[PDB]
Design a protein around this ligand. Structure first.
Ligand SMILES: *[C@@H]1O[C@H](CO)[C@@H](O[C@@H]2O[C@H](CO)[C@@H](O[C@@H]3O[C@H](CO[C@H]4O[C@H](CO[C@H]5O[C@H](CO)[C@@H](O)[C@H](O)[C@@H]5O[C@H]5O[C@H](CO)[C@@H](O)[C@H](O)[C@@H]5O)[C@@H](O)[C@H](O[C@H]5O[C@H](CO)[C@@H](O)[C@H](O)[C@@H]5O)[C@@H]4O)[C@@H](O)[C@H](O[C@H]4O[C@H](CO)[C@@H](O)[C@H](O)[C@@H]4O[C@H]4O[C@H](CO)[C@@H](O)[C@H](O)[C@@H]4O[C@H]4O[C@H](CO)[C@@H](O)[C@H](O)[C@@H]4O)[C@@H]3O)[C@H](O)[C@H]2NC(C)=O)[C@H](O)[C@H]1NC(C)=O
Ligand SMILES: *[C@@H]1O[C@H](CO)[C@@H](O[C@@H]2O[C@H](CO)[C@@H](O[C@@H]3O[C@H](CO[C@H]4O[C@H](CO)[C@@H](O)[C@H](O)[C@@H]4O)[C@@H](O)[C@H](O[C@H]4O[C@H](CO)[C@@H](O)[C@H](O)[C@@H]4O)[C@@H]3O)[C@H](O)[C@H]2NC(C)=O)[C@H](O)[C@H]1NC(C)=O
Ligand SMILES: *[C@@H]1O[C@H](CO)[C@@H](O[C@@H]2O[C@H](CO)[C@@H](O[C@@H]3O[C@H](CO[C@H]4O[C@H](CO)[C@@H](O)[C@H](O)[C@@H]4O)[C@@H](O)[C@H](O)[C@@H]3O)[C@H](O)[C@H]2NC(C)=O)[C@H](O)[C@H]1NC(C)=O
Ligand SMILES: *[C@@H]1O[C@H](CO)[C@@H](O[C@@H]2O[C@H](CO)[C@@H](O)[C@H](O)[C@H]2NC(C)=O)[C@H](O)[C@H]1NC(C)=O
Ligand SMILES: *[C@@H]1O[C@H](CO)[C@@H](O[C@@H]2O[C@H](CO)[C@@H](O)[C@H](O)[C@H]2NC(C)=O)[C@H](O)[C@H]1NC(C)=O
Ligand SMILES: *[C@@H]1O[C@H](CO)[C@@H](O[C@@H]2O[C@H](CO)[C@@H](O)[C@H](O)[C@H]2NC(C)=O)[C@H](O)[C@H]1NC(C)=O
Ligand SMILES: *[C@@H]1O[C@H](CO)[C@@H](O[C@@H]2O[C@H](CO)[C@@H](O)[C@H](O)[C@H]2NC(C)=O)[C@H](O)[C@H]1NC(C)=O
Ligand SMILES: *[C@@H]1O[C@H](CO)[C@@H](O[C@@H]2O[C@H](CO)[C@@H](O)[C@H](O)[C@H]2NC(C)=O)[C@H](O)[C@H]1NC(C)=O
Ligand SMILES: *[C@@H]1O[C@H](CO)[C@@H](O[C@@H]2O[C@H](CO)[C@@H](O)[C@H](O)[C@H]2NC(C)=O)[C@H](O)[C@H]1NC(C)=O
Ligand SMILES: *[C@@H]1O[C@H](CO)[C@@H](O[C@@H]2O[C@H](CO)[C@@H](O)[C@H](O)[C@H]2NC(C)=O)[C@H](O)[C@H]1NC(C)=O
Ligand SMILES: *[C@@H]1O[C@H](CO)[C@@H](O)[C@H](O)[C@H]1NC(C)=O
Ligand SMILES: *[C@@H]1O[C@H](CO)[C@@H](O)[C@H](O)[C@H]1NC(C)=O
Ligand SMILES: *[C@@H]1O[C@H](CO)[C@@H](O)[C@H](O)[C@H]1NC(C)=O
Lengths: 301, 226, 210, 37
């Protein structure tokens, strides 16, 4: 049971709780800061969001969530075939083929809506799907020119080690040093306008040179899909994307800002019964990445 | 430029309404924020409250339940009505023009700023005393002198502070020296002014001290001569 | 309450703010001589109004952590007053109260001796059945004097009132001193004195009824 | 910290009691190279 208060709108909390020490018969009243998305009610009384569903494992604070280029190789006696077709859509017979032993440097970037730090497309921007007439097939559009996005959580956070047992340390958010601000992302409204114009150009080749192409935001789901969900410097962002997909196209300095929230209790995938506490990151987080792809979903003017 | 001058009772009985006014000179009243500040003896500068150029009320929660700052734009004058006064309300009340500063630290769009107010021009001050004792005018007694010489005026038992002393209606101003008051055990202040004067002009030039005590509406004069 | 601070004449003063900020700050500095209108010295952390000497300077917050301090270089004797730190910041709400009055006292000022001037009872108040000696003291520093009245050669100690040493415009101090007498007590004596001991020396001024 | 005490490891690390069937006796070990070495 946590005793939480607002921090001097009302997003990040300040919670205190009786905690076990290094002696099995001694308690301690330590405090810590938690984001809103990690706590639920019952001074007001709170609780970690995962306690009624799953156990929780704090990520080891030495391993890095940095996408390192991974190369997938086939064993001896097998081979991998590449496709040198600069306009190769998803399926079909690749005219120019070459064999490789290992794939290129693939960064395992866990993203959402916006494909981050991925590989570009040569020649023109490509768009892929199994059956583009099937609206239940996510459209995988891949840019040819990268539109740059800058994200940052500007709060100068502090990490506080809390001995919860013999050799067991819980890393908590001590307090904010300085200003309390909003985590957000920036894209160039010009480079995003021309990138949406290139995407909208290839969208007519199988939808009609006269029909209108409209962009709207998500229509429901979980936070991991309704928002640009990614990782920046080690903390998991969840960025509102209504400022990017709000344009209707007809037959014929700038900066957009995305209000991101931050969460620490995350189920990485759809894993049931398993949760992870990402330890807080000291300093001011800011990461510079390219959005090189996109995952759309038409409605079905 | 802009200057202010307060005025008020000077003496208000306990458990009453402490009325006060402040007329500003050289500026429009309806495009600047105005703030009231009092300073009690021993205590620090206490912020009463402030009114905006939009005529919005916002008071210090230490008071609030007794303050109601008004403003009439027909003149360049705004008031201040502290009621249910007690003994601790005696202070010098100041009339200052507050200007608004918008301290932006993050993004103006998310609301990452805060408003701070600073007073740049001030009123001279108005002494207010709270006591069940009635007012009382003084009584000027002349102090006759005897290269250089000195003469003055004794302003005996009066209540309450202050009294203003002018010499020759304002002509004699060099060498003047008015002293702080003295609170007697009877409960009345006794002030005395004195003017250093060249000795040759003692028998020729005339000297008249002009003593005024506002809580008693009294204007009195007196002559000094050996 | 009051925080004491002592600097020397012509040196640099370092008035540290009472409440250090939690976030980005906008600190206003105020000079207040007691019994006078406060004077705004610095409104924005570093901005001063029109008519403030350059020797007054406040620290701006370019990087967080640096605390706000008021810097007075070449301190004059007139820079003896209360200095308030009006601290606003993003974390604390609406700062209604001013700072803690730092009472800056300048050391090493010229030691000036008093100027006693004793007046006898006036003819009007003597005709009004009440006598009053007034012993005016002025232009002394440091501002702290002890007054001793004497009927002829005997101490009086009964029925005397004395001002606290208030400061003058010339940065020196002054104080009155009244001895109330009956019109017959003042006539039945040969002389009346006003011993004024300032620092470590006395100054006598006698007055007789003739 | 009768006088109050504590195990030396409690402020640094967890502690595992050795299984009281395994022996700390140095048994002759032979290191062998694989075939081809
Ligand atoms: C992603 O996208 C995001 C959104 O698109 C984007 O967000 C942006 O983030 C940045 C950084 O986080 C933000 O930058 C901040 O901006 C603040 C506001 O700056 C503006 O306003 C001030 C003040 O404006 C008033 O005063 C000027 C005169 O000074 C007048 O001309 C104005 O008209 C105005 O006065 C009227 O308006 C008032 C209302 O506000 C009324 O009350 C008043 O009566 C008047 O009617 C301006 O000075 C700024 O001008 C600067 O900008 C122009 C271009 O517009 C530049 O060419 C030029 O460089 C100008 O300097 C601007 O218009 C800033 O306050 C803030 O900087 C201060 O704060 C930080 C942290 O607190 C300090 O570390 C820093 O040092 C600054 O402090 C100085 O200033 C304060 C306040 O005055 C002082 O108290 C302090 O002591 C210090 O003074 C020192 O520096 C002074 C010079 O700065 C100097 O004069 C002093 O002598 C002393 O040395 C910071 O820069 C930005 O606002 C966000 N964008 C938006 C839209 O909100 C993000 O960056 C993107 N990228 C990412 C996330 O990677
Ligand atoms: C999240 O919530 C926690 C609470 O669980 C906050 O932690 C507390 O923070 C407050 C400040 O906000 C701390 O209060 C401060 O304590 C200081 C320590 O002084 C103590 O010890 C001395 C002995 O040296 C005693 O004499 C003294 O009485 C105290 O018991 C004080 O120095 C502070 O005093 C300040 O305030 C007073 C009155 O307001 C002023 O008069 C002083 O001049 C001075 O400015 C203050 O009292 C408290 O100790 C913290 N608790 C713990 C357990 O650490 C977190 O700050 C909060 N974090 C966020 C981000 O919201
Ligand atoms: C997309 O790719 C980008 C680059 O490939 C990613 O940006 C990287 O983000 C990480 C973490 O956010 C940064 O690592 C941090 O490095 C700083 C210090 O770096 C500085 O100092 C070193 C000196 O050794 C210098 O070599 C660097 O160039 C910097 O000047 C540390 O303080 C942190 O703890 C952390 O280690 C990378 O530096 C940064 N790379 C670049 C090129 O900016 C981006 O995060 C990727 N986006 C996603 C969503 O995965
Ligand atoms: C933190 O601040 C928010 C914002 O004011 C508080 O939200 C209020 O919560 C109460 C319930 O106690 C509601 O009745 C109000 O309608 C809410 N207001 C808003 C604007 O949402 C919240 O209670 C605060 N939490 C703490 C612990 O102080
Ligand atoms: C664990 O508790 C959470 C509390 O948030 C439950 O989730 C909420 O459940 C209520 C009603 O069951 C819904 O109205 C909310 O929309 C739910 N919120 C979220 C974020 O899911 C959750 O169902 C509980 N789990 C179990 C297994 O009891
Ligand atoms: C984001 O933008 C481009 C990729 O579109 C990268 O910068 C270029 O990288 C290529 C190969 O790495 C170089 O040949 C170019 O010279 C680079 N251009 C510039 C202007 O630097 C950049 O590394 C990308 N960042 C990623 C993928 O994290
Ligand atoms: C974030 O806050 C920390 C302190 O919590 C700052 O670290 C300080 O850095 C200065 C150097 O400029 C050192 O002198 C201090 O000793 C450091 N303090 C601690 C506690 O380590 C850090 O500079 C801040 N960073 C930003 C970007 O604001
Ligand atoms: C994202 O951040 C990068 C770097 O922080 C920005 O690139 C800088 O742009 C300015 C202005 O054109 C140049 O003066 C710098 O030299 C650039 N930095 C580098 C390393 O080349 C970029 O503009 C930002 N983009 C957005 C949308 O915020
Ligand atoms: C993402 O941002 C948009 C606006 O940029 C938010 O839209 C708000 O939606 C609510 C309904 O839920 C309306 O009542 C508000 O008026 C909308 N605001 C604006 C400015 O249009 C949207 O809620 C945000 N996403 C989330 C999940 O909060
Ligand atoms: C755990 O406690 C032991 C107590 O013995 C600490 O070791 C002593 O630490 C003090 C001061 O830190 C030194 O003066 C002694 O010389 C140390 N003795 C030994 C045997 O190391 C130890 O540092 C503590 N460990 C932690 C992580 O706090
Ligand atoms: C810790 O336990 C004590 C025992 O009575 C209780 O009073 C206190 O509220 C508890 N604190 C928290 C944060 O649960
Ligand atoms: C890819 O191209 C081939 C031939 O050009 C075509 O048959 C196939 O339908 C295309 N893919 C999609 C998803 O339309
Ligand atoms: C999508 O936009 C609508 C209107 O702009 C808004 O009501 C809704 O909350 C938004 N949803 C998300 C997930 O941003």
């Amino acid at each position: 049971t946590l005793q939480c208060t607002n921090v001097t709108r009302g997003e990040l909390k300040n919670c205190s709780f009786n905690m076990t020490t290094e002696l099995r018969d001694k308690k301690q009243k330590v405090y810590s800061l938690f984001y809103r998305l990690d706590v639920v009610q019952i001074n007001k009384e709170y609780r970690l969001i995962n306690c009624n569903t799953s156990a929780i494992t704090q990520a080891c604070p030495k391993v890095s969530f940095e996408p390192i280029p991974i190369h997938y190789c086939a064993p001896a006696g097998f081979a991998i075939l590449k496709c040198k077709d600069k306009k190769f859509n998803g399926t079909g017979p690749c005219p120019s083929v070459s064999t490789v032993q290992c794939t290129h440097g693939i960064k395992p970037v866990v993203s959402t809506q916006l494909l981050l730090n991925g590989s570009l497309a040569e020649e023109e921007v490509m768009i892929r799907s199994e059956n583009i007439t099937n609206n239940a097939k996510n459209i995988l559009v891949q840019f040819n020119t990268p539109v740059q996005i800058n994200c940052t959580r500007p709060n100068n956070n502090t990490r506080k080690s809390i001995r919860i047992g013999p050799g067991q340390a819980f890393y908590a958010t001590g307090d904010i040093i300085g200003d309390i601000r909003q985590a957000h992302c920036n894209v160039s409204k010009a480079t995003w306008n021309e990138t949406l114009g290139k995407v909208v150009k290839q969208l007519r080749k199988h939808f009609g040179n006269n029909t209108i192409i409209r962009f709207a935001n998500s229509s429901g789901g979980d936070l991991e899909v309704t928002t640009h969900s990614f990782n920046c410097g080690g903390e998991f962002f969840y960025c509102n994307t209504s400022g990017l997909f709000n344009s209707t196209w007809i037959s014929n300095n700038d900066s957009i800002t995305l209000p991101c929230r931050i969460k620490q209790i995350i189920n990485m995938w759809q894993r049931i019964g398993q949760a992870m506490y990402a330890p807080p990151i000291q300093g001011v987080i800011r990461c510079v990445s390219n959005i090189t792809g996109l995952i759309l979903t038409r409605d079905g003017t | 430029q802009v200057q202010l001058q307060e005025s008020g009772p000077g003496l208000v009985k306990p458990s009453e309404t402490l009325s006060l006014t402040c007329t500003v000179s050289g500026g429009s009243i309806s495009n600047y924020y105005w703030s009231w500040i009092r300073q009690s003896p021993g205590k620090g500068l206490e912020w009463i409250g402030y009114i905006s150029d939009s005529e919005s009320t916002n008071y210090n929660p230490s008071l609030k339940s007794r303050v109601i700052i008004s403003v009439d734009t027909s003149k360049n004058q705004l008031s201040l009505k502290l009621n249910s006064v007690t003994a601790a309300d005696s202070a010098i009340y100041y009339c200052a023009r507050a200007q608004q500063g918008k301290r932006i630290y993050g993004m103006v769009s998310f609301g990452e700023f805060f408003y701070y107010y600073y007073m740049d021009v001030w009123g001279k001050g108005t002494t207010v005393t709270v006591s069940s004792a009635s007012t009382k005018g003084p009584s000027v007694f002349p102090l006759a002198p005897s290269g250089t010489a000195a003469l003055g005026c004794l302003v005996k038992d009066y209540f309450p502070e202050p009294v203003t002393v002018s010499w020759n209606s304002g002509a004699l101003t060099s060498g003047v020296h008015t002293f702080p008051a003295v609170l007697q055990s009877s409960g009345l202040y006794s002030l005395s002014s004195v003017v250093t004067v060249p000795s040759s002009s003692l028998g020729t030039q005339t000297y008249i001290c002009n003593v005024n005590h506002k809580p008693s509406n009294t204007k009195v004069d007196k002559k000094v001569e050996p | 309450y009051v925080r004491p601070l002592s600097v020397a004449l012509g040196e640099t003063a370092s008035i540290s703010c009472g409440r250090q900020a939690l976030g980005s700050r906008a600190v206003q500095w105020y000079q207040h001589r007691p019994g006078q209108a406060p004077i705004l010295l610095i409104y924005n952390n570093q901005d001063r109004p029109s008519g403030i000497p350059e020797r007054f300077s406040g620290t701006p917050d370019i990087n967080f952590g640096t605390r706000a301090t008021l810097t007075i270089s070449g301190v004059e004797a007139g820079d003896e007053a209360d200095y308030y730190c009006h601290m606003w910041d993003s974390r604390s709400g609406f700062s209604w109260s001013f700072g803690g009055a730092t009472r800056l006292t300048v050391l090493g000022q010229p030691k000036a001796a008093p100027s006693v001037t004793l007046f006898p009872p006036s003819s009007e108040e003597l005709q009004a059945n009440k006598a009053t000696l007034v012993c005016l003291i002025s232009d002394f520093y440091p501002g702290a004097v002890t007054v001793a009245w004497k009927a002829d050669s005997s101490p009086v100690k009964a029925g005397v009132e004395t001002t606290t040493p208030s400061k003058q415009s010339n940065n020196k101090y002054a104080a009155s001193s009244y001895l109330s007498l009956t019109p017959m007590q003042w006539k039945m004596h040969k002389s009346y004195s006003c011993q004024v001991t300032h620092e470590g020396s006395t100054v006598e001024k006698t007055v007789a009824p003739t």
